[PDB]
């Protein structure tokens, strides 16, 4: 939080992926860590971009305290960020919402149950209902 | 949504307990027609055609051959108001301990009384069980009950009111002496074998206007037995207390480990929970829980739930233990305990070293009275004498007693269902009491 001094290293350029990769070295003297939103904010103006155009992960704090090493990415456009950044990091900051597809267990059971019927099942449902009405 | 209650059933031999129970289960969606028709065929080959309804609960070979309910048996049926399961009591002085095990895990009670000429007089006699079974119900914690006058077609003339009114008058005089208010108790005339006045109103007996009850909570007035089962009050379930479920049975189920089964007297049992059985001292984890072939997440108090243990064995586990959460205060072995007991007539005198088969909850064991502390008044715990020399019938007393065999017990203040007990000696109920203090091991 004090004297963050975000220094970037190993900067590279990828017109292939429309992104620039760099191992971001951040020092946090007398402070524990720097929050992910913190480095992303000042990552915008050093690369002359916006907040919602950068991506950083890692940040394993060096033993003893006062240093942290992480790897960061910057994307040129919002649409480029959507089409390249993975969904887990998208929902992470503010970029999208993770919809709960129930869980793996019920989906597998539903798939097997749907596999046990040959067709839509509307005729099967009405046939079993008529036969088992009594 | 529908609540859940638990009933037990009681009565004299050949009063029509299992016939009334089984046929009531059949009417309320228990079993389909081909199952009971099979039972009619097999019992006709045996020779006991009348017992086809009794066979539904009496499943054992020795029970069906003899035509005798030896051990208790469970069976469910959904009434109009809520869920309920029955305890089929033996109704014998031979198997009186099995009745005490069944009635101890029951909230309400259905006192079946014979109406036929001669059988009622034999039932309510010195040797009969109608006096005993009603007394044993109030002893173990069955506060509310229902009386059912059975075999109305058997008596001569058939469906005679004078006979019904005579039985209700005779029971009302005795049942007041036990503790039950006969105003609050419902008296229903029925026929178990015929299937009369149980589900629907009877055509054979229009004279019967209707039973009625006068409680503090709410009044009820029904025509049939089924409506009287709906009018039973929801009991007070102590969910907040530490678990104190004395086990009922321990099965080794196919493809799902060891499965301990028992009613949650107190607390909430659930899957993935370590438990400790009290006398044997065996710690183990439960795999899963069930109640009448249906799985459960939360086993609430007063339920026929059944956990399943794991990482151990069926012999380490046993009928009688208390799965007090190995995390919460578990049930410990009792070396000696302060358990007052009042007596209900011991032909012999009660002094010391006398080990009757203390049947606290579901467990029966001989207990020797180390000594007698104080002769106490019949009520309010009033101290009358210091250090008595002997005790007689019709007298209360605090007594410290050492079990002859490892037993688990607990105080009445902590656990009301656990604290109840009776005493038996010379094939008769000599005393009845409650435990206030207990020394752990």
């Amino acid at each position: 939080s004090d004297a963050v001094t975000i220094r970037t290293r190993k900067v590279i350029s990828n017109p292939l992926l429309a992104r620039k990769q760099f191992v971001v070295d951040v020092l946090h003297p007398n402070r524990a860590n720097v929050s992910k939103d913190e480095l992303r904010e000042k990552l915008a103006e050093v690369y002359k971009a916006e907040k919602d155009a950068v991506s950083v992960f890692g940040f394993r704090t060096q033993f003893g305290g006062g240093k942290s090493v992480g790897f960061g990415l910057v994307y040129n456009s919002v649409a480029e960020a959507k089409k390249f950044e993975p969904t887990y990091r998208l929902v992470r900051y503010g970029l999208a919402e993770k919809v709960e597809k129930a869980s793996r267990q019920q989906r597998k059971q539903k798939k097997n149950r749907d596999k046990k019927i040959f067709g839509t099942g509307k005729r099967l449902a009405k046939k079993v209902a008529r036969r088992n009405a009594d | 949504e529908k609540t859940h209650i638990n009933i037990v059933v009681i009565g004299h031999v050949d009063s029509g307990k299992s016939t009334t129970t089984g046929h009531l289960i059949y009417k309320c969606g228990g079993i389909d027609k081909r199952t009971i028709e099979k039972f009619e065929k097999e019992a006709a080959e045996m020779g006991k055609g009348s017992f086809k309804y009794a066979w539904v609960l009496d499943k054992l070979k020795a029970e069906r051959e003899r035509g005798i309910t030896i051990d208790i048996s469970l069976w469910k049926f959904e009434t109009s108001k809520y869920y309920v399961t029955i305890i089929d009591a033996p109704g014998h002085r031979d198997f009186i301990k099995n009745m005490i095990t069944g009635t101890s895990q029951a909230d309400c009670a259905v006192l079946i009384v014979a109406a036929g000429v001669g059988e009622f007089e034999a039932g309510i006699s010195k040797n009969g069980q109608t006096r005993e079974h009603a007394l044993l119900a109030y002893t173990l914690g069955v506060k509310q009950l229902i009386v059912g006058v059975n075999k109305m077609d058997s008596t001569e003339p058939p469906y005679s009111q004078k006979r019904y009114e005579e039985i209700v008058k005779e029971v009302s005089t005795y049942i007041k002496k036990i503790g039950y208010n006969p105003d609050t108790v419902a008296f229903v005339p029925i026929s178990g074998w015929n299937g009369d006045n149980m589900l629907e109103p009877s055509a054979n007996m229009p004279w019967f206007k209707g039973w009625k009850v006068t409680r503090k909570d709410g009044n009820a007035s029904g025509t049939t037995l089924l409506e009287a089962l709906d009018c039973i009050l929801p009991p007070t379930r102590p969910t907040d207390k530490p678990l104190r479920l004395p086990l009922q049975d321990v099965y080794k189920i196919g493809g799902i480990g060891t499965v301990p089964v028992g009613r949650v007297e107190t607390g909430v049992l659930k899957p993935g929970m370590v438990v400790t059985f009290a006398p044997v001292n065996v710690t183990t984890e439960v795999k899963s829980v069930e109640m009448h072939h249906e799985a459960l997440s939360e086993a609430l108090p007063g339920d026929n739930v059944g956990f399943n243990v794991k990482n151990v064995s069926v012999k380490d586990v046993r009928r009688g233990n208390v799965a007090g959460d190995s995390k919460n205060d578990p049930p410990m072995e009792a070396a000696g305990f302060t358990a007052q007991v009042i007596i209900l007539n011991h032909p012999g005198q009660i002094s010391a070293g006398y080990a009757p088969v203390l049947d606290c909850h579901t467990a029966h064991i001989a207990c020797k009275f180390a000594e007698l502390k104080e002769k106490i008044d019949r009520r309010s715990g009033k101290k009358l004498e210091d250090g008595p020399k002997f005790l007689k019938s019709g007298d209360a007393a605090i007594v410290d007693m050492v079990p002859g065999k490892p037993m688990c017990v607990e105080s009445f203040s902590d656990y009301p269902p656990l604290g109840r007990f009776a005493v038996r000696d010379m094939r008769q109920t000599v005393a009845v009491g409650v435990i206030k203090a207990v020394d752990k091991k």
Partner: protein, 258 residues
């Protein structure tokens, strides 16, 4: 076992891929293609661990699906395409053309070539036969089939494939005084000149290739690749040019660089 195998555990993969042994238990098995699986390089490992352009497996898939790389003129879309020796990957973006040439140490390299050099690819022919309808053809090391070749072209020579048109434009005969490139074996990646050879008409022809520093070594004829005459390489040689310095000379080179 009851058919082919489509898997590669991350312990039987070729060691020149420079793959680790902790990131997963499997390896990117190359699909069937021009080169063998043990003598080529999948596009996934080349872009993820060599160029470091892509981090994860899906990033390589996204780059490949976006029609960016061009291997031997063809764009290609398979993540496990077996790109081996004499394979040129052209990237329209970043303005770099990459050529797969072995290094002195025994792995692949990231040698950068000009756009003119990427227009032609050298190829060592393996078989010359008279095919159906009487048409002659040659079989290069990459498996390319070129019809109606030069009659002077025989077995164990090298041709200059035009790549863009797929036509032979120049052929280099195999004789003494020819700069070659060893492909495969414990002596792979060495560049030297041929002095003589013992024919040994029982298989496994041997050729005595001599380095520019008077170092001589023996390599089977199946592992050689003529890349030009003496002193003039038809291809831009990688850095070092296969000097093959010893462990002592390498250590002094490091101490003279730090």
């Amino acid at each position: 076992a009851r058919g082919p195998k489509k898997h590669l555990k991350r312990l039987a993969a070729p060691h020149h891929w420079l793959l680790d042994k902790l990131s997963g238990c499997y390896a990117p098995r190359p699909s069937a293609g021009p080169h063998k699986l043990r003598e080529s390089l999948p596009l996934i490992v080349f872009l993820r661990n060599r160029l470091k352009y892509a981090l994860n497996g899906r990033e390589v898939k996204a780059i490949l699906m976006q029609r960016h790389v061009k291997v031997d003129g063809k764009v290609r879309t398979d993540t496990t395409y077996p790109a081996g020796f004499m394979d040129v990957i052209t990237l329209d973006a970043t303005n770099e053309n990459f050529r797969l040439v072995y290094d002195v140490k025994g792995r692949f390299a990231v040698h950068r070539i000009t756009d003119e050099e990427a227009s032609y690819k050298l190829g060592k022919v393996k078989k010359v036969q008279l095919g159906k309808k009487g048409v002659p053809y040659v079989v290069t090391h990459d498996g390319r089939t070129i019809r109606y070749p030069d009659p002077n072209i025989k077995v164990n020579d090298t041709v200059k494939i035009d790549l863009a048109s797929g036509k032979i434009t120049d052929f280099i005969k195999f004789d003494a005084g020819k700069l070659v490139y060893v492909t495969g074996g414990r002596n792979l990646g060495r560049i030297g000149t041929i002095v003589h050879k013992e024919r040994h008409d029982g298989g496994f022809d041997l050729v005595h290739i001599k380095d520019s520093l008077d170092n001589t070594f023996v390599t089977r004829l199946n592992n050689v690749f003529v890349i030009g005459e003496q002193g003039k390489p038809y291809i831009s040689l990688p850095k070092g040019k296969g000097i093959k310095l010893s462990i002592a000379e390498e250590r002094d080179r490091r101490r003279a660089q730090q």
